[PDB]
């Protein structure tokens, strides 16, 4: 009673109605800090191998921070309108680039390593100091790295320093590996426990707090982080997390398959597909449409998506799933004249657009070919099948738990007749196709009528 | 002892991450396909309670064997890295409550070299939504 599927043979499409929405309708900034060291150049007249190892670790840190210094930033689906993803994080970083704020933040983070602070620009942020380099470089090496008496026989010193250093070393590596702008953000930028604390300490609802505290595995792919500053003794870098202002809304996915007439002639065929495959999630009384499935992700029953690849479509667009011909909303489709075979993957099955003469088949691992189709839009579930072959592609079927419904109906392609139809339409719709057909009929008849 | 504890806690954060990440022009008409159907389907077959005990029993002696899952399609499984040994019979008998005499430094070195593999496994699980391509060598040497 949570997820299921229904496939309409009326226009040859599948609907997976079980997933629960997770829309990042808000952003959230958090400036993390790591207390650096303006180390004075090391100096030991006389080389012990442990001393050389300590020197090499310090020099590796120095190359890390030199790198960081130099990197301180010194088919429908084509009308969405792109957006500046990194605007908020780099805007906060810019707010930091004003001279005074860094001392304020450092003072606010002197005692603890987590605090809510108000920047110069008014919007409150939450900041961390996860790794402290000043302590373990000042009061653990300098008192024991004296000029001449470089007695560092304790080997484990270098091991502790390396374990407390590799985190920031990978931070600088990722700064230099992703143009200072990376997604996902690795744990060396924010430890998972630190992430849980951040989610628990930020201003969102308790249900959303639990929701985003236990759902890390997708957030990183919906998160971002650019460098802010090394201004004074500290490495400060912003993180951009989501804020689910829309939750607990039942939203679904739409998969598409061509309809065609099935004349024995391989050529002169007429084919129609629904060009609206993607995601529909309900937020504010109208659906949110993601055209390209590369902007949405799946987690069991929670689908996590970013709305910046979304439009808001009227709720009447849902009626395009029952009657594509209704005039309430002009459903979007694409027409073409090429006859070839293929199949598409729904949540619990696959739609075989078996066109031409390819030997399409549905089978299970241990049974083999159990069903053979015949030249047309057909659908098969996942229940007893996990291998559908068309031509030479052998697709698997996701074996999630659900109930499959198959609505019979005469394909609309039957209504469309050849010899008049236009053989080129991708951004077309029902209304546009009908208008063009009426225009062609009027021209043909008036040309004949005038006789 | 501090270093040993830090390594153990790093492993514990790795496995906490693993726990929390549990997953249940022409060229436009091809028809996309489910890449992860087979792997996650086999995983789901594993999520049935009984199979893991059988798999463990079949991999008790060696670290490579062909086993038949509950779903019928035979699979082949390894046990490339063994954390139970080096955490059971080579730290616990030498990590007693009070007599934490671990003067031998190379204990931590050996544990780290036998741990970093699974540490990278969990990192990649959390770096690619538990779904990555290519698979790094720490997933299969």
């Amino acid at each position, epitope marked *: 009673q949570n997820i299921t599927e229904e496939f309409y043979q009326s226009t040859c499409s599948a609907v997976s109605k079980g997933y629960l929405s997770a829309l990042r309708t808000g952003w959230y900034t958090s400036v993390i800090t790591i207390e650096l060291s303006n180390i004075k150049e090391n100096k030991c007249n006389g080389t012990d191998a442990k001393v050389k190892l300590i020197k090499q670790e310090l020099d590796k840190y120095k190359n890390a921070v030199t790198e960081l210094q130099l990197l301180m930033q010194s088919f429908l689906g084509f009308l969405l309108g792109v957006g500046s993803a990194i605007a908020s994080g780099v805007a906060v970083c810019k707010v930091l680039h004003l001279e005074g704020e860094v001392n304020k933040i450092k003072s606010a983070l002197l005692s603890t390593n987590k605090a809510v602070v108000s920047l110069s620009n008014g919007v409150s942020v939450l900041t961390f100091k996860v790794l402290d380099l000043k302590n373990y470089i000042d009061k653990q090496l300098l008192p024991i790295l004296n000029k001449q008496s470089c007695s560092i026989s304790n080997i484990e010193t270098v091991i502790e320093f390396q374990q407390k250093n590799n985190r920031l070393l990978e931070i600088t590596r990722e700064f230099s590996v992703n143009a200072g702008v990376t997604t996902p953000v690795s744990t060396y930028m924010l430890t998972n426990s630190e992430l849980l604390s951040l989610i628990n300490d930020m201003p969102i609802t308790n249900d959303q707090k639990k929701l985003m505290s236990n759902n890390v595995q997708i957030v990183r792919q919906q998160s971002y982080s650019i460098m802010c500053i090394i201004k004074e003794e500290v490495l400060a870098y912003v993180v951009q997390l989501p804020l689910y202002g829309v939750i607990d809304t039942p939203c679904w996915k739409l998969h598409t398959s061509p309809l065609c007439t099935t004349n024995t002639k391989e050529g002169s065929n007429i084919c129609l597909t629904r060009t609206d495959r993607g995601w529909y999630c309900d937020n504010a009384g109208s659906v949110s449409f993601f055209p390209q499935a590369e902007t949405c992700k799946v987690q069991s029953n929670r689908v996590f998506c970013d709305t910046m690849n979304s439009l808001t479509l009227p709720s009447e667009v849902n009626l395009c799933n029952v009657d594509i011909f209704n005039p309430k909303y002009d459903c979007k489709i694409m027409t073409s004249k090429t006859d070839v075979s293929s199949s598409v993957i729904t949540s619990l099955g696959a739609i075989v657009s078996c066109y031409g003469k390819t030997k399409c088949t549905a089978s299970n691992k241990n049974r083999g070919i*159990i069903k053979t189709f015949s030249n047309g839009c057909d659908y098969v579930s996942n229940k007893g099948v996990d291998t559908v072959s068309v031509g030479n592609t052998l697709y698997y079927v996701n074996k999630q738990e659900g109930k499959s419904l198959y609505v019979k109906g005469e394909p609309i392609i039957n209504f469309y007749d050849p010899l008049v139809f236009p053989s080129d339409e991708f951004d077309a719709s029902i209304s546009q196709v009908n208008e063009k057909i009426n225009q062609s009929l009027a021209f043909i008849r008036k040309s004949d009528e005038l006789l | 002892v501090k270093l040993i504890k830090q390594e153990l806690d790093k492993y514990k954060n790795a496995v906490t991450e693993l726990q929390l990440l549990m997953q249940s022009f022409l060229g436009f008409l091809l028809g996309v396909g489910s890449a992860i159907a087979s792997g996650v389907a086999v995983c789901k077959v594993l999520h049935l309670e009984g199979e893991v005990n059988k798999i463990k029993s079949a991999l008790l002696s060696t670290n490579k064997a062909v086993v038949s899952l509950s779903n019928g399609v035979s699979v082949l499984t390894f046990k490339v890295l063994d954390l139970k040994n080096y955490i059971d019979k080579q730290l616990l008998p030498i990590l007693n409550k009070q007599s934490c005499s671990i003067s031998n430094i190379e204990t931590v070195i050996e544990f780290q070299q036998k741990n970093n593999r699974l540490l990278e496994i969990t990192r990649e699980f959390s770096v690619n939504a538990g779904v990555t391509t290519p698979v790094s060598t720490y997933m299969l040497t």
Partner: antibody
Amino acid sequence: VQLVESGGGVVQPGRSLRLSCAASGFSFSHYAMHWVRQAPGKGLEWVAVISYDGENTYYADSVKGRFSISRDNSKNTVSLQMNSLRPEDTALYYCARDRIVDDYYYYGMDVWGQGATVTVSS
Amino acid sequence: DIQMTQSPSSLSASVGDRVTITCQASQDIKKYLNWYHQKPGKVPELLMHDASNLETGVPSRFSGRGSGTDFTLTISSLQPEDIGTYYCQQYDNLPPLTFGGGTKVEIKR
């Protein structure tokens, strides 16, 4: 991986009966469930197989319609209702797990239980 | 309905001997057959499935071969625990499923 039976008894011909099957220790949720019967000192012949979900059911032709198979996920339970009993249905019954997971197209039976004897006679 | 005849109806041998049991199907089945054990006074135990794939947890002495309508079960060296009754079952692409007539196995004195 345990299966036990309850309700097994005796009744005169033409009277309804129920057999309950209780499973433990394995995925009772992902598997198709079988019932088989064997008369004492005789060979097997199939009784019925209920799909993993309880939607699709299949029966033996000689007992088609007489049997009514049900399965409850909440009670971790299977049940067989026997209506219009005949004298020749006397036998020991085994409730069994299928050999493959959540498979509409059925296979043999892998995990069986002790079995419940049912006798019918005037 | 699919009808499967098993032969011989009853059989006897001695410890260490070899036995062969045949199971014939009414109509053609590619490889869809299983061989079942049933020890005396116990629940039936599934020897092997698909007529050539053993059920793990059992000795390798049992073997299954055949195709089409005819399948064969061969035991190389009998053991006293091997007594009881052997059966064959089919799952050819659809129900109804069906069991065989039976082959009893005991020993002489």
